[PDB]
């Protein structure tokens, strides 16, 4: 089992921004995906958004268009996750857990004098342990 | 030996620019150019 950090609880201003931080032991962030997730009590889960484990992709549930970036530390052993904008209604507690995936190529033509033409995506197969969580709450 | 003599009282008309031995040139410098050439790899992988 991977140890998980995450940032400690905070309280915000709103109309403002947030940020967060977690980690994973062993740097196996380069071995899993690292994926952000928001709830509220009484509520259903929420997907935040993603980083490959190869790093080279990320994406955002589209709620979030605009308000959420995701950075690393070199080397990855630590990922951060910065939310824009909060609100009363933004609180929420927060998530960082790991995650896998598969990557299938999507298309192909085979070029018989080059490389072949090929466009590839990714699956989520599943989330792996979650973090411990952080809560964010805005108020006055 | 690339023996030449001098023609005992001769003259001759020439015409530069009409003659096809440069024509011939032309194009036998070209044909060699690519009988080169045609032996070697394409480098069409190399449009990525
Ligand atoms: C020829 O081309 C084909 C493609 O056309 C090649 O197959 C493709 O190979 C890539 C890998 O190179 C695969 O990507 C990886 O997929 C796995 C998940 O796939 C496994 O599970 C399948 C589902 O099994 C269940 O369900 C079926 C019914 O559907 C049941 O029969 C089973 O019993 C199970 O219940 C299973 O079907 C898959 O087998 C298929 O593929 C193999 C080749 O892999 C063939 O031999 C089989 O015949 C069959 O077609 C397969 O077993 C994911 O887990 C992988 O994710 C890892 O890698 C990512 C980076 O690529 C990374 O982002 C992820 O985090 C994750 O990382 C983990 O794994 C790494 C090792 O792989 C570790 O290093 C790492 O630490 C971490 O642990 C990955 O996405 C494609 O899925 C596969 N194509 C398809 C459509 O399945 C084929 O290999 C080529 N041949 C040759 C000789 O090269
Ligand atoms: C040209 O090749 C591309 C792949 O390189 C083909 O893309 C495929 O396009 C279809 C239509 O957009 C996608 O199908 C999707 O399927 C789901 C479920 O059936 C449906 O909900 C969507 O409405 C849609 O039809 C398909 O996923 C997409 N493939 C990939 C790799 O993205 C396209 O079909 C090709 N054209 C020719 C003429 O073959």
């Known amino acids: 089992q991977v140890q998980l950090v995450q940032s400690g609880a905070e309280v915000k201003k709103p109309g403002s921004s947030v940020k967060v931080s977690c980690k994973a032991s062993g740097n196996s962030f380069s071995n899993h995906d690292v994926h952000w997730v928001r709830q509220a009590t009484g509520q259903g889960l929420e997907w935040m958004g993603w980083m490959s484990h190869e790093g080279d992709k990320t994406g955002l549930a589209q709620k979030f268009q605009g308000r959420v970036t995701i950075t690393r530390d070199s080397g990855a052993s630590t990922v951060y996750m910065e939310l824009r904008g909060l609100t009363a209604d933004d609180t929420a507690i927060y998530y960082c857990?790991?995650?896998?995936?598969?990557?299938?190529?999507?298309?192909?033509?085979?070029?018989?004098?080059?490389?072949?033409?090929?466009?590839?995506?990714?699956?989520?197969?599943?989330?792996?342990?979650w973090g411990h969580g952080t809560a964010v709450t805005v108020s006055s | 030996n690339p023996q030449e003599i001098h023609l005992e009282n001769v003259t001759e008309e020439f015409n530069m620019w009409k003659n096809n031995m440069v024509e011939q040139m032309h194009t036998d410098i070209i044909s060699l150019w690519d009988q080169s050439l045609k032996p070697c790899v394409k480098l069409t992988p190399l449009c990525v």
């Open positions: 857990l790991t995650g896998s995936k598969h990557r299938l190529r999507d298309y192909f033509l085979y070029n018989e004098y080059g490389p072949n033409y090929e466009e590839w995506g990714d699956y989520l197969a599943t989330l792996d342990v």
